[PDB]
């Protein structure tokens, strides 16, 4: 997806933009229901197109390693 950058910026920058945005654009399982219908609405904002559940998550992923730890303890 870093193809929009053409021959600019170098490997690292666009490799990481591709990887990050790739995971960001993946189907995400809604915490409310269970359908793979969560999309990003903005920075740290996630929403299910199915049930409409709007929630906070990571900046580019709905769940972060830190957030997954909270549940435990």
């Amino acid at each position: 997806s870093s193809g929009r950058f053409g021959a600019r910026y170098g490997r690292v920058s666009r490799r990481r933009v591709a990887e990050i945005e790739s995971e960001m654009n993946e189907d995400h399982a809604c915490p409310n229901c269970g359908e793979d219908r969560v999309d990003r609405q903005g920075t740290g904002i996630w929403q299910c197109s199915y049930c409409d559940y709007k929630f906070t998550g990571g900046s580019y992923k709905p769940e972060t390693p830190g957030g997954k730890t909270v549940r435990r303890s």
Partner: protein, 237 residues
Amino acid sequence: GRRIQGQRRGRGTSTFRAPSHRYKADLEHRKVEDGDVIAGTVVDIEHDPARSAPVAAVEFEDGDRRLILAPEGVGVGDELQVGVSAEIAPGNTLPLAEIPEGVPVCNVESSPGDGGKFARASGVNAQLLTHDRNVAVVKLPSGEMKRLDPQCRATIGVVAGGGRTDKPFVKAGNKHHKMKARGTKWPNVRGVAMNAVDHPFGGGGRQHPGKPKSISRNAPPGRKVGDIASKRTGRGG
């Protein structure tokens, strides 16, 4: 010579001020008489222009509608509680004493009732370690062990928007847009690229600082530049 840039800052002119009139809310904890009978419902999740992180709109029982510093995992419909008897779930706020040890926390108060000061940026958290009748030991995101009054309120969970820093800005324009939402002057011209009159490092036939960069703590403003009271520099040893 002339006043250095760091000196122009303090005057608080337009160029150095934050676009406050464009900000949404001052994120402070609600005030409760006692009892804890204060709960509300998350009505919406909004973007906070002052922090590049999400924030939650909550509607409280007693009719109060306010924005709250949102931890990760808070969504519309969720019921949040604030007080001594608040449930121990993510997104709720209660004094450190009522919080079980080993639980990640955010928006920690420095002095009880100040509304929260520590661990508020994207994806960060403080770690409540020790309890007592006198002191609650909390580990801040910087790694420091902070002694706090157990009466200092805090929110359960890590701050939302974690991982924001993982992605590179890539281009000047992206930085530009973010910078416009902060109280900062950008871009940054190196001191060594300036004239002697404008900076302690300015001047010369080529670019280099004319003295060592490590400056004393006692140096006066206009001179305190470079590596401030550095205990050490570099990477080796």
